[PDB]
Design a protein around this ligand. Structure first.
Ligand code: AGS
Ligand code: AGS
Ligand code: AGS
Ligand code: AGS
Ligand code: AGS
Ligand code: AGS
Ligand code: CL
Ligand code: CL
Ligand code: CL
Ligand code: CL
Ligand code: CL
Ligand code: CL
Ligand code: MG
Ligand code: MG
Ligand code: MG
Ligand code: MG
Ligand code: MG
Ligand code: MG
Lengths: 221, 215, 215, 213, 216, 217
């Protein structure tokens, strides 16, 4: 009977901008051009869930190998191997063999892991008619399971389409856009919460930096 | 004997539209993601029920009824209660996790609930033909309808297929323009066939109370 | 210097901009984005001919029903029903629920109703070759014709397929330009073969008396 | 220098440094209502009236009757010129490219014409256009060919090849400045000779095209 | 030894190119209609003959030989005389096309006239392949070649298919841009593999003596 | 510096090791993309040449268009004698230029094993390009090679490479630009991303001279 509740990301600044965190039991699209911090955001969401709340996490990777995910996270001071060893984090490898794709079977394997590891948080990294239907099915199944999910997507322009197929930002309940804008010859990273269905959030772009401690969203407007 | 209007009671809108939405006709409400389309179409029905006891049918193609109900709690509205009382019907035409068939279901619901208001949320040749027929059928039935559509640019095409704004009698455009790192929401009544309305963009906000439009 | 004869539209300001009205016995393309006043222009052309000159007219419609056309015209205080009753106006319904048939139908109505004025509302290679054929036989009848077309940008091609402007004798563009959140309606006579006309855009409004252009 | 024929279109022979190169073809490209047909007609009319140079006008869409009627408002009696055998309007307007070429050739020989106006896949267009230009040359005709374009500052003509195939290229523009239209003419290219460069304003009046260099 | 260059003697160009065109390679010269591509390619051969008694072969696809000759009279160049003397040869390649035959002919002409200089005037995937082949086979002959190509925008892709600038060793862009209602011609050497050149656009005019470029 | 997660090898290209905070990540691939004549080939040759001269690390250069002869001739612009390094067995130029990705990959592997190579330069549907590039990157990684892969782009500001996928499957992305503004060209280099560490951000000016690329951080 209440308006939708939120789970804290504990990503510095983010829970302020979102007025409490990510909407629980829903999926949030996080879209951005190359090297904008999408994998970082997805990982920091699980990592903080484990460390701060003992909420287990599942990370589903479609291209980066688990071993590279674990190695690159040490850049932010995080030991994911340790969390995997303890059974608090599971990295599901859906990356292709370096020798169509069945999202329906993949979903069942994601569910196994969620149940096995008792996970509350899920990150998934990363023809428009077909994209829309398939993305719709995935979002719906995750909701049914009860997971709170970050889903990354790619885009190719800083102030153009939200994602690549012009449908992702309509099927998603929540949309966050990471940008990396070239101003003069300098880059400025910003985060925007474009929409959160059924709840409030701050509007427009907020600058952030990536540091040895992950994402740092500057004190706000 | 010129066309009459039905009040939305959406604060600011009945002013811009000089009395509300043209009765017995369909209004397209187009907008990029998160612009307020669902909210407008829910507030249309909600106010019709609460202010005028005019029952409403909400047709959903993606969002589940459960999520529409949950999301409307953001605004302190209890849509489950209105459904339970028979004032509101949320018609689930979502896909599993035929345009004539859909029309027959909408007609059945309109008769069942004695509804006066409908919201529908949400090749150009085929699209234009199908939309025209949906619009014509709703008119024959007597529905006053809000139909939302998606668009991908704030100052580009009105909707996706470049035809929707031409077969619709009325067109409303919601915008969410990003400038200098800040967003500004606006509402425009682009066209109302056979009647008058204010022109250009009017600022609005979405708060705990729903849509507020400022002239 | 033999002048191309024109017939007065009596649309306020237009006969000034066109130096006497529309070229008689020819077709004028009237193109615009949604809700720019295309149908209004085409109806005002017929209405004024009947009321001012006892020149009967035929309105050919492809999407709006005659009933809605008549209803919307009440916005401007025009009783089109009465004119149809008196055989001064014929609304030809060419709506779905070949071009050859339509043309003979239009020819038939022109002969039957003594009509001098005609309004038609509303792959590029295909459009070009049979838009040209339509112009040719209307000219053969001796009709003076307004034909509306859609376009989707205010400053893009004249009409949707990028050919219509080249096969028409005469071209008029209605714009509804959005700048700084405000809209400005303008009318431009782009071309009138064989005769002079004022150039560029002229602002107009749509009010209770229809189109008012300010030269 | 190469020999040029005077168009006698006010201002144009100055911009082209003496007129159009004889025996060569000139593209005249513009958006709708920019004056392409007018330029075409004036080129023939002046050749006849001033220089007793007969002309052939080839039309693909506008009918001969309309061309004549439309010219009348400039005070030009084309029917009279057709009656005297000084002008031939060749109707190719609708209900073989080689068949048209031999129709043109035949009319040129028959009327002893020195001036021609033709109004109006990339691979095949370029191929078919190059073929047309190539044969007019062999004949010795001096030709104006109009083409359509859809933007004032954009490709020269509809298919992005026309300007590369033609010896000479003239662009007629009709540009919006604020809400006002301004007509200009530009000679982009004239192979083998000098010309004035850039855009020059013109008006269309009761006396045809008037360009101010 | 780094790649050597041969002087074009086109005024200002040898300064911009730091010595002329790289020997034994092809230079792409691209530009919109009427930018001076043919004139650059002719002036290259004409100066070859006049200044260095280096015979030249001009390969034409659009213009007839007769028109090439007539159009150069503008500049006081008597190409008819150069053809009569056997110093210039104009190879007519005007109208299922495939490159392999044309090369024999070019080669034929090159040894026949003892030519040092060549000018060729004028699916992206196939264009890239076929251009690559032409460039390679010309290189095998040892010819120094100017090959012109079209583009449709002053500040867009180097050439028409978006691949020509990548397979060419050297690239020169001629522009004809609107300044007000006036035109400004400029020449840019975009790239010369394995050697140096000045950067950016340099204005030029076309006069009764052909191309005149001002580097300073 | 020390407190970063990913080991790097120095390019010894003036200024680049500063911008990349230590050089190119070892055992990984770096995309180097740029319009025509931006310096892609020079960068990828300079990478190998410096590896050999400074650290006696052998390199393999894979060329898909330029012939070995021309690669060698063009490098003389900079005073580099690549023929001598090829004679000495320190450099191998693999000629894959025209008169099967799997066969190519096996050639590369064979050369890398045969020449004991530590540095590799490769010069130069969307998701068929994507999965083929992905495959290529994965295999070089399993070998342990550190790779520079150049790609083309057609606008200075616009897509990173031709197919809009190359920048997402690469671990590291460098963009070379050659911007024309007010009739003048200025060259810049940008490291857009390096997975797993920091790096200087934005564009940095550079020149190409008789000494190769000189970048000013
Ligand atoms: N209580 C609230 N206070 C302020 N804003 C709110 C509140 N609840 C929701 N919103 C806003 O309403 C937006 C959602 O509005 P919707 O009507 O769902 O938009 P939409 O255009 O239908 O988007 P789709 O269908 O997801 S593309 C959220 O993104 C919030 O910005
Ligand atoms: N009494 C009135 N006062 C002022 N404006 C009016 C009045 N009645 C109608 N209008 C305007 O006229 C417009 C309708 O013009 P139409 O001629 O129907 O446009 P249209 O170009 O034919 O649009 P289509 O066919 O729907 S794309 C409406 O959108 C109103 O803005
Ligand atoms: N007597 C006149 N006085 C002034 N302007 C005139 C006169 N007669 C014609 N015009 C103008 O000339 C224009 C037509 O010129 P054309 O040469 O027919 O144009 P066009 O470029 O051939 O256009 P098309 O073929 O219709 S796309 C008309 O649109 C008028 O603006
Ligand atoms: N004597 C001259 N004085 C000045 N300009 C001249 C002279 N002769 C020719 N021109 C100019 O040179 C231009 C022709 O140059 P070309 O080299 O033929 O151009 P192009 O780039 O090859 O064009 P194409 O192949 O027709 S697209 C003409 O358009 C004139 O502007
Ligand atoms: N000695 C030198 N001094 C200065 N600049 C030079 C020197 N040698 C070469 N250059 C420059 O280096 C550029 C070539 O760089 P490359 O590395 O071949 O470019 P690229 O990006 O690989 O271009 P492609 O493959 O031809 S698209 C030339 O265009 C010259 O500007
Ligand atoms: N310790 C650190 N300090 C500062 N910046 C860092 C640090 N570690 C990594 N980065 C930055 O993080 C970026 C990578 O972030 P990711 O989250 O991998 O981006 P991404 O959007 O997932 O990019 P992809 O998937 O390769 S397209 C690098 O390009 C660096 O700029
Ligand atoms: Cl940062
Ligand atoms: Cl708001
Ligand atoms: Cl108005
Ligand atoms: Cl004028
Ligand atoms: Cl000049
Ligand atoms: Cl430099
Ligand atoms: Mg990532
Ligand atoms: Mg919605
Ligand atoms: Mg209409
Ligand atoms: Mg014409
Ligand atoms: Mg040329
Ligand atoms: Mg290279």
């Amino acid at each position: 009977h209440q308006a939708i509740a939120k789970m804290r990301t504990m990503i510095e600044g983010f829970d302020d901008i979102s007025h409490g965190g990510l909407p629980i039991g829903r999926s949030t699209l996080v879209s951005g051009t190359s090297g904008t911090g999408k994998t970082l955001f997805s990982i920091q969401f699980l990592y903080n869930g484990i460390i701060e709340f003992d909420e287990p996490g599942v990370f589903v990777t479609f291209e980066e190998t688990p071993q590279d995910i674990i190695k690159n996270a040490r850049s932010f001071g995080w030991d994911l191997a340790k969390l995997v060893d303890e059974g608090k984090l599971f990295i599901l490898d859906a990356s292709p063999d370096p020798e169509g794709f069945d999202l329906s079977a993949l979903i069942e394997r994601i569910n196994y892991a969620i149940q096995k590891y008792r996970a509350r948080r899920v990150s998934i990294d990363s023809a428009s008619s077909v994209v829309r239907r398939e993305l719709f099915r995935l979002v719906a199944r995750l909701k049914q399971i009860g997971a709170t999910t970050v889903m990354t997507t790619e885009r190719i322009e800083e102030y153009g389409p939200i994602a690549r197929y012009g449908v992702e930002e309509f099927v998603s309940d929540n949309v966050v856009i990471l940008r990396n804008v070239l101003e003069g010859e300098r880059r400025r990273r910003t985060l925007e919460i474009l929409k959160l269905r059924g709840t409030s959030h701050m509007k427009g772009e907020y600058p952030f930096t990536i540091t040895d401690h992950g994402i740092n969203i500057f004190p706000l407007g």
